Design a protein around this ligand. Structure first.
Ligand SMILES: *[C@@H]1O[C@H](CO[C@@H]2O[C@@H](C)[C@@H](O)[C@@H](O)[C@@H]2O)[C@@H](O[C@@H]2O[C@H](CO)[C@@H](O)[C@H](O)[C@H]2NC(C)=O)[C@H](O)[C@H]1NC(C)=O
Ligand SMILES: *[C@@H]1O[C@H](CO)[C@@H](O[C@@H]2O[C@H](CO)[C@@H](O)[C@H](O)[C@H]2NC(C)=O)[C@H](O)[C@H]1NC(C)=O
Length: 391
């Protein structure tokens, strides 16, 4: 009954008798499944998750150069040196400047220079290794049991949670009162050669080869030191145009640059390892059964707890409380023409039943286009509601 309220919803009906039905579950999408003399079920894909992914490589996208230090030598005085050359946190370059009398040298010539600066990463991006094997799916199956709260109940408590693993693709969940439903799901979108690149609160799924060939400073997955970066040269530039001085320049944030490069790519919503992303399944309904197909018809009177409300798909919802005594019993329900002669429209919440008089029931039905009578219960106290469904 979760689907009631969700705009991206499909009403999949299986050719009655058939022991299977094919559905496509995805994020932000709900599915309602029906079959003759079988219970109506609601399916949602709650979460997609990677179980322990290996950090392939971490790249620096924004850097900072500090501690700029220069050692020079007069012509003929040798090559200059700093310890920073040994220190891996620094990026160094040797060059030549014009030396002579007016800048401290007894001789006139090309005096050797050396400049070192501290490479500090400010923003970086991990790309975690995904294998289709360690990819888990979380499906919620909610039967149409009229349960008082069930209507668009986001919490989940009402439905049976199920995990689809590529190691355990076939799962048989026992639905309390309806029997078992075997679910056979197939992973679709390759994930073998795919890196799940994580930026900030933004993340995507990208090619292994594309990732690995980025012109940026990087660190191997294994590294948790985070001090000295491979390829600093990709963000650092040394300038000496007039042999007067050597200038060290940062290449500017690559954050927005990256977002633009990632336009064509598969964007995914991410939060604490979970990717809220086209998972195609087969449903075995042979082992499913209607709760109450052998219960007798309610004879009592019914009260209207929640007024008829129309869903975005033309369907209607009614919440009613039983005031009789026969419970557990089948609630009588009918949609007829104004002249109460023709049976019209269909019932989504098939075989509506009362379990307890105290607990109200929610019924979803598809009214016909135009005027109809929604008749819930039996005479006396028979509820005769009127509906309009314009074209
Ligand atoms: C969504 O569902 C929750 C709780 O789920 C149900 O709780 C029981 C009442 C019962 O129907 C279970 O089978 C379900 O799992 C709703 O919270 C309940 O609120 C009522 C008061 O309105 C209270 O009596 C219950 O104790 C609450 N349940 C719990 C466990 O706190 C919640 O209101 C529902 N929300 C919507 C918008 O439908
Ligand atoms: C980068 O430069 C700063 C100085 O601007 C260095 O820090 C100083 O030296 C010691 C640590 O080596 C501190 O106790 C001082 O308090 C710092 N002084 C100031 C003014 O901040 C820093 O060590 C240099 N970086 C490296 C890695 O050597």
């Amino acid at each position: 009954m979760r689907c009631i309220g969700i705009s991206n919803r499909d009403f999949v009906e299986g050719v009655s008798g058939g022991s299977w039905v094919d559905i496509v579950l995805e994020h932000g999408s709900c599915v309602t499944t029906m079959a003759k003399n079988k219970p109506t079920l609601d399916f949602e894909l709650i979460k997609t998750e990677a179980k322990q992914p290996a950090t392939l490589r971490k790249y620096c996208i924004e850097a900072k150069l500090t501690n700029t230090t220069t050692e020079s030598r007069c012509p003929t005085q040798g090559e200059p040196s700093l310890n920073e050359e040994q220190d891996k946190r620094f990026i160094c370059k040797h060059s030549m400047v014009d030396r002579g009398w007016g800048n401290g040298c007894g001789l006139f010539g090309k005096g050797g220079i050396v400049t070192c600066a501290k490479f500090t990463c400010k923003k970086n991006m991990e790309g975690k290794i995904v294998q289709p094997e360690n990819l888990e799916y979380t499906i919620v199956i909610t039967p149409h049991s009229g349960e008082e709260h069930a209507v668009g109940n986001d919490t989940g408590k009402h439905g049976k949670e199920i995990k689809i693993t590529p190691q355990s693709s076939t799962t048989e969940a026992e639905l309390t009162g309806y029997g078992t439903v075997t679910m056979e799901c197939s992973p679709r979108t390759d994930f073998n050669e795919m890196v799940l690149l994580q930026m900030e609160d933004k993340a995507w799924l990208v090619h292994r080869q594309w990732f690995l060939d980025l012109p940026l400073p990087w660190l191997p997955g294994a590294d948790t030191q985070g001090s000295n970066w491979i390829q600093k040269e990709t963000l650092v530039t040394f300038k000496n145009p007039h042999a007067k001085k050597q200038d060290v320049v940062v290449l500017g944030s690559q954050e927005g640059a990256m977002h633009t490069a990632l336009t064509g790519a598969t964007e995914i919503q991410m939060s604490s390892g979970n990717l809220l992303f086209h998972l195609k399944c087969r449903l075995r309904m042979d082992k499913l059964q209607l709760k109450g197909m052998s219960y007798s018809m309610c004879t009592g009177k019914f009260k209207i707890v929640k007024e008829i409300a129309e869903t975005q798909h033309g369907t209607i919802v009614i919440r009613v409380q039983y005031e009789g005594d026969g419970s557990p019993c089948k609630i009588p329900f009918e949609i007829t023409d104004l002249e109460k002669r023709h049976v019209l429209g269909r019932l989504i919440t098939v075989n509506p039943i009362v379990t307890e008089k105290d607990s109200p029931v929610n019924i979803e039905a598809e009214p016909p286009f135009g005027d109809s009578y929604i008749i819930v219960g039996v005479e006396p106290g028979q509820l005769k509601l009127n509906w309009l469904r314009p074209l």
